[PDB]
Amino acid sequence: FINIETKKKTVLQCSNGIVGVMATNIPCEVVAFSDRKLKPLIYVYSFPGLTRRTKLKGNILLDYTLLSFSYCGTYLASYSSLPEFELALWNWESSIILCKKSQPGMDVNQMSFNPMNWRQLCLSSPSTVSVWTIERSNQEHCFRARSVKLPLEDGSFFNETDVVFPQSLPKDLIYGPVLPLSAIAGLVGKEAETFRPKDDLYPLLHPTMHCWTPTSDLYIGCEEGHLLMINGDTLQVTVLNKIEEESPLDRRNFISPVTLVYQKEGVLASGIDGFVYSFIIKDRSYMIEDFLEIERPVEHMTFSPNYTVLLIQTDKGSVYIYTFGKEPTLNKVLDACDGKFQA
Amino acid sequence: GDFNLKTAPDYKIPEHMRINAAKKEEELGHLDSLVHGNKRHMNKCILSLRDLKVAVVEEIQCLVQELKNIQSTLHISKHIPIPKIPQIDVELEIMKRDEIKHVYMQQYLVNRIKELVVTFDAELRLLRHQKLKLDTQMKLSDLHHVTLFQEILLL
């Protein structure tokens, strides 16, 4: 724990091994961290006393890939690590798993609660975006996943013809009726339903970072430079169009948003170039402006609760803070070395 | 009245309807062009399938090598058999954490290899579906080739 103003460092030693995933609920001043060992007890501590409020224990055996507190603070979603891949909602005050669902195969890169709706939880993987509805009756909760159709790498939408039941082509009246394409060799089972052409394996948009609007929509960044809307209720997708003002002779036409955090006037994005950009977004279009330049590429970025302090973390571990309306704007809290101390 | 016939002696062939050996030979030439075109398209697709087989075998090779790398740091008691290659106090805790971690990379690489094998075999299911559609087409193409050549030989 590093204080910004006084530059003091306090160590909370995990007595059982290296700390795994990290999350904080600021309105409750609680810090929930997983321990990277056999029993992934989510240690929820309270700050500044560093007092162990609770240990959350599940059926998991390594860690949780992500921990995410709700905006209300009464719930903590955990997307578990290997090997379960269980998304579990925790009433961490009571240490009770309200619901859980195992999804082996898809690896969640980012998850986030909807701040205005604790029942909506977005999980973004490198291939899919899923919106999860926590459907409750009395004391039972269940997870209803809703995978969202993503556009192709050019931003177009693929019309999925029913592979098992193709529509009626004109029957060539000598050469047999037109069958489903996996018939004439016939792999019996789920392979015929997961059957797709490898010549028609069209790649989809890679979702990198999703952030929530005040209107329960989702800003999603792509490695192809695209910015996507996903409504948390209707799951509609419409690719944003860049307002390209004719400024010639510059190679900044491709920007890959590593992270995206919402601001009251748009989205703060960060690229691999070390540039933080301002995306001023109007209905179905966006304009990119240069907001900040950093010597090293930006890995993570977040806002303060009062939205006046801006934490920007680079790939090497360097931490910068952009204070809005104060000179100097950028202050380096941590100067990062290689970290791998050999001698 | 009457429909276009070609047998009755009262019927006389229209002079444009008069079918000659040049017409029959041109028709057989067009049919042969269609046959060669369809066969060339399917053989091009099959060559693409063969190169796709080479590519998926190479990807399975890379995944099997990564599987051996992650199994090197894996304890023996939680081992999962390698998919076959296609032919053309604190210390114990995180030690066993590493064990089950490499167990799930093992399961993920096995499931990914299974997905690639299933999708390649399903690609073969596609092109075999396009095979017997066109096999039934080219066999009748040879049949109507014989019909036209009998019409060529007689006329």
């Binding site: - | 030979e25 030439g29 299933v118 075999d121 092109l127």
Partner: peptide, 29 residues
């Protein structure tokens, strides 16, 4: 006179296979 010989792609899990046509040059017609 051979344009492309018969090549047979086999499946991995299953015994399903596909054989290409023995392509020859088209006739003088």
């Amino acid at each position: 006179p051979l344009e492309s010989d018969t090549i047979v792609v086999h499946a991995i899990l299953s015994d399903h296979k596909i054989s290409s046509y023995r392509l020859v040059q088209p006739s003088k017609y």
